[PDB]
Write a protein that binds this ligand. Structure first.
Ligand SMILES: CCNC(=O)c1c(C)sc2nc(Cn3nc(C(F)(F)F)cc3Cl)cc(=O)n12
Ligand SMILES: N[C@@H](CCC(=O)O)C(=O)O
Ligand SMILES: [Ca+2]
Lengths: 284, 275
């Protein structure tokens, strides 16, 4: 028996922080700068994050912008839920197997392993052909993360449009950025360089820029601008390109789609969304 | 396949011009029902020409989604207002099924979403505050707006009523709202003149229209506070009837236009400014 909604998410700071539970199985009581308690949820997920390796599901602690949004949605709409982290650790692309298949969170939502995707999930054409997206909860774009002192104008910098084995740039595998570089004919030369250096996760890529292993990381500005504000050794460069929104993902037949979007509009209009932005995204 | 479409003039999103015998250039025909007198219902549809950012989006959708349309300008209200549970404006025309869709500077909001289906947003908007350069105001949260009588003389600020801006201020800042009504403006042009003739200190309105107007202001005197900052952020969307069969293809086409760079081109053509 269970009418509990299965929620899928991904580790992506400051939207979703993933931490180990305490030895008793609970979440450490933490507070914001405002003195308010950090709302935290139990999220099951694999410990061996390595590809093609056995996945051992363990309870973990999940909090952040996306967790507070879920909690507000669950309260507004009156639904019960259980959160888990995407087994393969990916956002989701459609790949050729003649048959085609969705991987990542997309795959889980379409297989029925999830009933809702609550994460910084990009709203694009490819995904919208198969799932219902809510009205966006955030509007942002793509930017470039580099180690401080690296001079790059942006996406139209010669070190990017004319690729070399010297200057190595990348994004995350099976992500919306990957989709974008693969579909756009103008970025074909850029995608061929990228496909060789793309990372399993944004955390692996951000670490690789820190370790001088990767020179430029092309990713979500909501994530990059936060990361550069915390790790002052890393800097974002240039202006935003391919502006896009983040939204809640559901299957086309979902009976919650109308109320998920209404709740997101109410939250934009009453300042709740701006309050989440201030608590999690806006750091000096 | 031949759709009744409603629009409303608001530069640069929808610009209305007089006819040449027909409509030339990037203009599309748009009719306006004009009354014979104000003591009768009798009137005539005047043939006009329509252009703008939103008209270019409609031209691209008609080609991509494959539909033809009869475009008309709304005469019963403006964007949309619920009066004793009865909607007027572009929202009302869709609700009472006189139009299959509404195209223009139409703000997505929760109460309009209860009665109409909205496309994905295609223009970023919200509420902005316009002032003459040098007016010390943080945003809508400023005590000059929140508690206006704490100041001598009090801050003079208003909006154009009956739209999504006034509705949001009414729902969030009840004191500010009841105070603002004496500064209600007939339209954007009257508001900008009141700011320049020192008769108004601040004009609160749709972020996308204010940013366009600031970017074109002769001498660059009128500015949007912050970096053209947006409170209660939302977007313009196409309104369609609830359960509309057109929504799917319209969203997919809009997402394709952003992806291809067609949307950035339209922003360059219609929205960029000098200031
Ligand atoms: C076709 C896909 N749309 C876009 O890529 C897009 C624009 C091109 S302009 C714009 N503006 C918002 C602003 N916005 N709009 C809303 C809402 F809820 F009203 F939909 C919330 C927020 Cl953030 C969101 C958004 O995705 N876009
Ligand atoms: N775009 C607004 C009109 C202007 C405003 O009230 O800010 C609306 O759809 O209501
Ligand atoms: Ca369900």
């Amino acid at each position: 028996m269970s009418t509990r909604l299965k929620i899928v998410t991904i580790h992506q700071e400051p939207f979703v922080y993933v931490k180990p539970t305490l030895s008793d199985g609970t979440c450490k009581e933490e507070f914001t700068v405002n003195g308010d308690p950090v709302k935290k949820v139990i999220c099951t997920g694999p410990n061996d994050t390595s590809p093609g390796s056995p996945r051992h599901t363990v309870p973990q602690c999940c909090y952040g912008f996306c967790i507070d949004l879920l909690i507000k949605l669950a309260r507004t709409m009156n639904f019960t839920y259980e959160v888990h982290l995407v087994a393969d650790g990916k956002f989701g692309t459609q790949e050729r197997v003649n048959k085609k298949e969705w991987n990542g969170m997309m795959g889980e939502l379409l297989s029925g392993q999830a009933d809702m995707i609550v994460a910084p999930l990009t709203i694009n054409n490819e995904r919208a052909q198969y799932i219902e997206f809510s009205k966006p909860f955030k509007y942002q774009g793509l930017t470039i993360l580099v180690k401080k002192g690296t001079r790059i104008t942006g996406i139209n910098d010669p070190r990017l449009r004319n690729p070399s084995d010297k200057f190595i740039y990348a994004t995350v595998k099976q992500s919306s950025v990957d989709i974008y570089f693969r579909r756009q004919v103008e970025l074909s030369t850029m995608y061929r360089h990228m496909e060789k250096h793309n990372y399993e996760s944004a955390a692996e890529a951000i670490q690789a820029v820190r370790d001088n292993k990767l020179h430029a990381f092309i990713w979500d500005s909501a994530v990059l601008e936060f990361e550069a504000s915390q790790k002052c050794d890393l800097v974002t460069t240039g202006e935003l390109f391919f502006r896009s929104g983040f939204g809640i993902g559901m299957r086309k037949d979902s009976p919650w789609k109308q109320n998920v979007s209404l709740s997101i509009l109410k939250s934009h209009e009453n300042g709740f969304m701006e309050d989440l932005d201030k608590t999690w995204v806006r750091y000096q | 396949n031949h759709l009744s479409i409603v629009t409303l003039e608001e530069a640069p999103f929808v610009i209305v011009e007089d006819i040449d015998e027909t409509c030339v250039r990037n203009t599309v025909p748009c009719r306006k029902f004009v009354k014979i007198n104000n003591s009768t219902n009798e009137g005539m549809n005047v043939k006009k020409c329509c252009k703008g950012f939103c008209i270019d989006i409609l031209k691209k959708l008609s080609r991509t989604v494959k539909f033809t349309y009869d475009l008309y300008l709304v005469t019963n209200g403006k964007h949309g207002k619920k009066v004793n549970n009865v909607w007027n404006g572009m929202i009302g025309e869709v609700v009472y099924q006189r139009a299959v869709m509404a195209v223009g500077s139409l703000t997505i909001n929760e109460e309009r979403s209860e009665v109409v289906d909205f496309s994905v947003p295609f223009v970023e908007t919200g509420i902005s505050v316009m002032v003459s350069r040098g007016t010390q105001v943080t945003g809508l949260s400023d005590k000059k707006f929140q508690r206006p009588h704490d100041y001598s003389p009090p801050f003079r600020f208003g909006t154009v009523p009956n739209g999504s801006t006034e509705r949001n201020i009414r729902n969030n800042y009840p004191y500010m709202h009841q105070y603002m009504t004496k500064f209600n403006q007939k339209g954007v042009e009257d508001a900008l003149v009141s700011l320049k003739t020192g008769k108004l200190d601040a004009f609160i309105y749709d972020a996308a229209v204010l940013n366009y107007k600031a970017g074109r202001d002769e001498g660059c005197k009128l500015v949007t506070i912050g970096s053209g900052y947006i409170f209660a952020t939302t977007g313009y969307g196409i309104a369609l009837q609830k359960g509309s069969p057109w929504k799917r293809q319209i969203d997919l086409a809009l997402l394709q236009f952003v992806g291809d760079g067609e949307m950035e081109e339209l922003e360059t053509l219609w929205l960029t400014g000098i200031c």
